[PDB]
Design an enzyme around this catalytic site. Structure first.
Site, PDB file in Angstrom:
ATOM      1  N   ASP A 275      10.886  -6.616  -7.926  1.00  0.00           N
ATOM      2  CA  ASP A 275      10.335  -7.491  -7.253  1.00  0.00           C
ATOM      3  C   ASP A 275      10.897  -8.903  -6.699  1.00  0.00           C
ATOM      4  O   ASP A 275      11.422  -9.631  -7.643  1.00  0.00           O
ATOM      5  CB  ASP A 275       8.706  -8.010  -7.955  1.00  0.00           C
ATOM      6  CG  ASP A 275       8.010  -6.687  -8.229  1.00  0.00           C
ATOM      7  OD1 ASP A 275       7.663  -5.752  -7.471  1.00  0.00           O
ATOM      8  OD2 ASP A 275       7.701  -6.704  -9.368  1.00  0.00           O
TER       9      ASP A 275
ATOM     10  N   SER B  40       5.318  -5.510  -0.284  1.00  0.00           N
ATOM     11  CA  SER B  40       5.725  -4.049   0.232  1.00  0.00           C
ATOM     12  C   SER B  40       5.283  -3.577   1.615  1.00  0.00           C
ATOM     13  O   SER B  40       5.886  -4.440   2.506  1.00  0.00           O
ATOM     14  CB  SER B  40       4.537  -3.173  -0.854  1.00  0.00           C
ATOM     15  OG  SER B  40       4.828  -1.977  -0.953  1.00  0.00           O
ATOM     16  N   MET B  41       4.741  -2.747   1.872  1.00  0.00           N
ATOM     17  CA  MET B  41       4.638  -2.327   3.108  1.00  0.00           C
ATOM     18  C   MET B  41       4.071  -3.714   4.152  1.00  0.00           C
ATOM     19  O   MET B  41       4.365  -3.853   5.255  1.00  0.00           O
ATOM     20  CB  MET B  41       3.512  -1.193   3.245  1.00  0.00           C
ATOM     21  CG  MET B  41       3.854  -0.039   2.851  1.00  0.00           C
ATOM     22  SD  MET B  41       5.400   0.727   3.683  1.00  0.00           S
ATOM     23  CE  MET B  41       6.692  -0.057   2.369  1.00  0.00           C
TER      24      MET B  41
ATOM     25  N   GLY C  33       0.738  -1.101  -0.237  1.00  0.00           N
ATOM     26  CA  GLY C  33      -0.084   0.071  -0.131  1.00  0.00           C
ATOM     27  C   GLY C  33       0.652   1.315   0.098  1.00  0.00           C
ATOM     28  O   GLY C  33       1.909   1.393  -0.522  1.00  0.00           O
TER      29      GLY C  33
ATOM     30  N   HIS D  53      10.153  -4.989  -2.219  1.00  0.00           N
ATOM     31  CA  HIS D  53      10.561  -4.187  -3.266  1.00  0.00           C
ATOM     32  C   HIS D  53      10.752  -2.870  -3.242  1.00  0.00           C
ATOM     33  O   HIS D  53      10.354  -2.460  -2.185  1.00  0.00           O
ATOM     34  CB  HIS D  53       9.591  -4.422  -4.523  1.00  0.00           C
ATOM     35  CG  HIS D  53       8.186  -3.828  -4.346  1.00  0.00           C
ATOM     36  ND1 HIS D  53       7.438  -3.679  -5.422  1.00  0.00           N
ATOM     37  CD2 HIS D  53       7.851  -3.264  -3.481  1.00  0.00           C
ATOM     38  CE1 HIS D  53       6.283  -3.250  -5.040  1.00  0.00           C
ATOM     39  NE2 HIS D  53       6.612  -2.766  -3.688  1.00  0.00           N
TER      40      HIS D  53
END
Lengths: 180, 181, 182, 181, 180, 182, 181
Positions: free
Chosen positions: B159, B85-86, B56, B110
């Site tokens: 990624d 991610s987060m 996000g 990433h």
């Protein structure tokens, strides 16, 4: 759902979870929460998960899967209507010996669907991933069904539709219910 | 969601927060509020944060992150399904020693994504910002994982998908749960 | 849905009555199956009534309801009110033999399955083979419920077949045409 | 969010207001209402306003601002995650000495954005207005931070992003948290 | 609607059903449910069905219709505002002698509307159907009004708008209320 | 809108406070008028406070509020918080003379009516004539509330006119600029 | 609409119905239901119907109209803000002698709007209908106002806007209020 108090909620009171939609981050989150809750109420008593789903996200599915194997209670699965992709998977994740299906239930299995977009690199990154995912899942299925990996591989190359009996034979379910 | 009290709410009663969606200003605001609330009820007892998110907003994430470190209670994280991610970040922010993940959980990390639009200046302003953000986060990860900054940098260039074990090895989680209690 | 007397549909469920008045999809099926299961837990002895006014729906969603009906202990009585087509008609016929009613101007329509394929020759074959079996599977179930020989059901559902309450009675879909409840 | 009492509502019970969205006529109206309500319950006790917002309408912001300075209670502000445009402004409006921010919080300030449309006259009317607005706000910032107007002017010519420390140094916050108590 | 506990609901408490929208599978399902419910509370007491509708689905209508004739209670109908297509029909289905309408009420009747699409055969299948439907309904109207079929047929060839009095004369309503 | 006992805005209404923080349309007017009427029924003696932060709205919707304010027995005090333009400004000025406040950085804007015609020459004339009267009607009301002579209000609202709290005080729109709630 | 119990509902308790939107099958159905309900609670006591509407469907309007004349209670109408098309109509339907309007209220009357589509026949069917509708309504207005039909006809050929006084003069309202109670 008829506000009689949610209908699905009263059913949860008798330790029954209803999955009747596609499987996405959201649905998974709900069902996982239901599983966790039931396990907190009585980690001893069995849990029943009715399944009528077209499938869904690979990850959302595994979340459910792992949660089922994780909790103490044994989760019994009943394919009612139709169970495909992850749906089929979850049906097979049910406690060995308590994975049922009704007479005209239908079950379908197949390899993963996805998409890449961008630079050669990026696509390779995605292709490598999905391929492992496919491999990871197939192995899980082999254990749950008893079929050798080789079979699961060749058998899920393209949409494979099976009847309740065909499903029983493959090792997805254990028995076909007829009366409750 | 069922009402057998809101399901997610009843689960909050046993001090469990469920994050199962993308992370945006709104989700962050909710989870932070849940954390703050739990800390007021008993700043002594542990808190469990299940995580299955695609990632996000960088800021929305940090809000959660800082809130976790800020409150007295220790927040235990469990990657269930997927954390990227987060999402991955938050999993790693869990109290060292209590960051778990289930067998088939998956974790991806990433570098930050963003966008600039306008005058050269304006774009520079944005490029300089995101770059610092990247650097800021990478440093945090280094601490949480143990990996040297150099590694985190090169490893998140594109990624990077990791399995539960691969995740354990990297230093994102501490143990892979298989049985409860 | 008027709030009080609380869902009206809900109060009606209290007297063991399920209302199906929409197309049949994974969602509707899930609700109705849930209602059936609930009623069976409250008193597996008492009868259940399923009013039906539906244009039809998904083959699978339907069978889910179907099987659930045959599965539970209680006997499910069906009443075609207004209109019952495709799976709707099917479900009406699945009601406990002898308790499958329909009102005076009710209407019933049966027909072969609708679907779609898309992709490689292989893929299409996979779908064509499937639907065909589905058709065959359903037709057989209908033969049992109606009494008509498979041959008839086959030729009779080649294209949309519309029937009146009487015509429906004659075919073996319903047992009696209700007229009042004094 | 989760109903376990709405969560944001239960948090309001402990005198905490959560701003985690852009600031528009509507949000302003809600927060102002919350402030007024809290002041009526106990005009003596402190109030805490968590802030994670991208900014918003200049007027909507000032409404909040003035309301904060207007009520008897002292409003403490905590930048959690991110505070920009009006958001940053509101953070600085907090009772001097009680304007906090968490470790990885981020704060951004900049001059006003707007638009004119129509006849030369009409555009002039708008340009003259926004310019005064800019000037009005800058002055307020000067007081809250301590920086001389000259600085605020030049510093907000274009998006200016600051870290928690950079924010502390500028005079936007007073202390950076870490451990509750 | 405002709470009185809903307003339409409180009105249902005095055995009054409000139909103020087009008639579709959904609306029919609701009203039928209300009728069934009222019949269970006291199969002796009368029921009042206010009607202000532009019409709707032929089947959805008949469902209501049949349900009205089916239950023990006598259903009184009151056209308030406007009753057309099925709406008009339902007004006429009310217990003979208790089918009212207010001063400026308006009523319109007409033949069925529909659509065919596909092969010649398919279209014929639909044309044959609708035609019977038209015929079926017309007959019902004949009984309810007293008009001979011939009249109903020719009179509903195209939209036919009637005033309260014109409606009284045709045999759709029995009396025009002024002040109850 | 956080429900806490119960919706924030409602509890505030308990202390006789009405919050207008949105554009003004038939709907908003209907709500605020309803609130005013309700408060007047609870205690036609006690004062009422109407906080205002609105961009303006429909001329009619506004007057509905306006008239309702002057109509009820209670005296309605207005507080411009944030911003009050078009009808918004108007309503602020409608507050009981002597109790029309505004906070330090409040902002107030006034201007002539906006509208549109469409159709035949006649039809457009009908609309032009109408709006013009409306403009005239409102300007007169403003003159009374402010004290400014009509001539001034006319020339001053030819185009958007933005005023600060002080400028607003000077014009006669507000009476005092608050600083302490007390 | 704030939940005090809902504002509009509490107002209904004092026998007051609020019509503040366009008039369509739905709104009519609600208002009719409210009228019927009030008549059941006390067919003796008066009812007040505030009106601020742009007009609506001719049938939806008549439903309200007839219902007003039908019930035993006398319905008093108050044009607050604006009453046009059916709205104006309903205002005039109020019990003669108790049809009020506030100082700056505004009232507009006009002939019916509609549309035809299809074969010549079909269009004629619709033209004939609307024309009768116009005629039917005009007659009702004549009675309520006192104006001769001829006047109503010519006067509603095109949008006719009237002030409170102009409305009083025409015979639409009876008095203009200025102090409640």
């Amino acid at each position: 759902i008829p506000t009689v108090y949610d209908i699905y909620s009263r059913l949860l009171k008798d330790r029954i979870i209803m999955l009747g939609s596609a499987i996405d981050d959201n649905v998974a989150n709900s069902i996982v929460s239901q599983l966790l809750f039931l396990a907190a109420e009585d980690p001893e008593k069995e849990i029943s998960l009715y399944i009528n789903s077209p499938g869904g996200s690979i990850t959302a599915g595994m979340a459910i899967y792992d949660t089922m194997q994780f909790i103490k209670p044994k989760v019994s699965t009943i394919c009612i209507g139709m169970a495909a992709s992850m749906g089929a998977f979850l049906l097979a994740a049910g406690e060995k010996g308590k994975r049922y299906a009704l007479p005209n239930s239908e079950v379908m299995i197949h390899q993963p669907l996805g998409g890449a977009q961008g630079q050669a690199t990026e696509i390779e990154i995605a292709a490598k991933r999905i391929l492992l995912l496919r491999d990871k899942l197939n192995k899980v299925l082999a254990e749950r069904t008893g079929q050798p990996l080789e079979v699961i591989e060749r058998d899920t190359d393209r949409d494979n539709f099976k009847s309740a009996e065909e499903a029983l034979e493959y090792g997805l379910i254990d028995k076909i219910l007829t009366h409750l």
